[PDB]
């Protein structure tokens, strides 16, 4: 109940990764397209924690 900014940033990135991955796996014809787009956005989101 005392998550830091980095802890919350990672948790949202995992949620974003799963969410966006499913989004572009449906949109694209392959699951890899979701993995790439979901991974890149989550990595970009988790690498920029506001502080």
């Amino acid at each position: 109940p005392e998550v830091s900014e980095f802890a919350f940033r990672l948790m949202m990135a995992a949620v974003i990764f799963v969410g966006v991955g499913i989004m572009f796996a449906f949109a694209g014809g392959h699951w890899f397209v979701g993995l790439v787009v979901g991974g890149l956005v989550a990595a970009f989101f988790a690498a920029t924690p506001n502080s």
Partner: protein
């Protein structure tokens, strides 16, 4: 009913980010579910309606 102490105990930025992502993902998944089912697949039903395929 107060519902304003939550902004005092929690970080407002965390709350807004969490709500924004969850609702957007929820709204996105529902749209994907409708496109998956043959019913309510508005793209397919409109194509049949106007004799596309």
């Amino acid at each position: 009913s107060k519902f304003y102490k939550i902004w005092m105990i929690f970080d407002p930025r965390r709350v807004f980010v969490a709500q924004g992502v969850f609702l957007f993902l929820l709204a996105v998944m529902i749209h994907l579910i409708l496109l998956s089912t043959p019913s309510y697949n508005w793209l397919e039903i409109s194509a049949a309606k106007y004799n596309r395929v």
